[PDB]
Amino acid sequence: AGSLKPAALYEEALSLVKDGDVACRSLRTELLECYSDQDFLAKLHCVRQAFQVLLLDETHRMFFMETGKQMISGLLVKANKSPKAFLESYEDMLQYTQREETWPVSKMELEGRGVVCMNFFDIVLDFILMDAFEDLESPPSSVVAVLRNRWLSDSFKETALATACWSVLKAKRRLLMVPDGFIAHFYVISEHVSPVLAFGFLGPHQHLSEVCTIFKQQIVQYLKDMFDHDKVRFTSVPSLAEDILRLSHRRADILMGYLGI
Ligand SMILES: CCCCCCCCCCCCCCCC(=O)OC[C@H](COP(=O)(O)OCCN)OC(=O)CCCCCCCCCCCCCCC
């Protein structure tokens, strides 16, 4: 129970957890430093409600959109890369998302990939970000061997890692239930972003490495904080939404500052 004090919303959610009526794609208990799987699920339900409320306000939707745009751009230019491609892919990704008629199909795809809830957390934070990080945490058998090769120039290691990323993304694209849907639109973004992150987390640049490491650190810390009952109030939905919003702005400012925007 640690420092957990009695909270209305939290206990309401915990009821559901004990019934078994709260679902999740991947347990993030240890990563997000929760007390237990039960604790994680309760807080998860609460966070879902919080974002569901938060994203009705169009100002906040704009905040998150703009934030994503700027942070990925900053990462890209700090990787000595041009952000134009990513900017366009991101943009029409959003324009596709805003179309209300796309959403049943999107629901089908995401459910087909294990997403158990149409929520900002489930889609953007868990399915898109934390999965990307968990992916670049464990590169293929082959890639690593190419990386520990003393004889290869690191320009070659660059193009090699790029090729590997494209190969993985290709195998993923082959399994698309829909050619031009949510996950495809996202696979283009991934096409323009994943190589950079990969060569940051695995490459020997050592200044791309620091930037990437700190980027990931900021995101993961943001999520940890979001699941911290002492950082945010799991008492009511309006209060949790207020706290999560402020946390978002804070950590955003921090990351922007680090990237030099
Ligand atoms: C430091 C940390 C800072 C905070 C984190 C910032 C994260 C930035 C996220 C930017 C997108 C916000 C979308 C706002 C609209 C919304 O949220 O839509 C919430 C809806 C549920 O609501 P709805 O269906 O009822 O309709 C809502 C009205 N449209 O589901 C969604 O998610 C759909 C939106 C999906 C957008 C995907 C964008 C992917 C960006 C990937 C970045 C590159 C990563 C590459 C990794 C290889």
Residue numbers in the entry: 307 to 567
Please give sentences taken from the publication describing this entry:
Mitoguardin-2 (MIGA2), a mitochondrial outer membrane protein, forms the ERMCS in higher eukaryotic cells. Mammalian MIGA2 has several distinct domains: a mitochondrial targeting transmembrane domain (TM) at the N-terminus, a coiled-coil domain, the FFAT motif, and a large C-terminal LD targeting domain. Here, we report the crystal structures of the MIGA2 LD targeting domain and the major sperm protein (MSP) domain of VAPB bound to the phosphorylated FFAT motif of MIGA2. MIGA2 (yellow orange) forms a complex with VAPB (gray) via the phosphorylated FFAT motif and then transfers lipids between the membranes by extracting and interiorizing lipids into its large hydrophobic cavity.
We obtained crystals of the zebra fish Miga2 LD targeting domain (residues 310–568), which we refer to as zMiga2. zMiga2 shares 74.9% and 76.1% sequence identity to human and mouse LD targeting domains, respectively. A crystal of zMiga2 diffracted X-rays to 2.85 Å resolution, and the structure was solved by single-wavelength anomalous dispersion (SAD) using selenium as an anomalous scatterer. The zMiga2 structure resembles a “mug” and consists of eleven α-helices. The central six helices of the mug surround a large cavity of approximately 1100 Å3. Intriguingly, inside the cavity, we found extra electron density that seemed to correspond to that of a glycerophospholipid, although no glycerophospholipids were added during protein preparation or crystallization. We modeled this as PE with two 16:0 fatty acyl chains, since PE is the most abundant species in bacteria cells cultured in LB media. The central helices are amphiphilic with the hydrophobic sides facing inward; thus, the cavity is hydrophobic and can accommodate the hydrocarbon chains of a glycerophospholipid. Side chains of helices α3 (F370, M371, and M377), α6 (F426 and L431), α10 (I525 and Y528), and α11 (L561) make hydrophobic interactions with the first hydrocarbon chain. The hydrophobic side chains of helices α4 (Y396 and M399), α6 (I429 and I434), and α9 (F488, F492, I495, V499, and L503) contact the second hydrocarbon chain. Based on its structure, we found that zMiga2 has a positively charged concave surface in the handle region composed of helices α7 and α8.
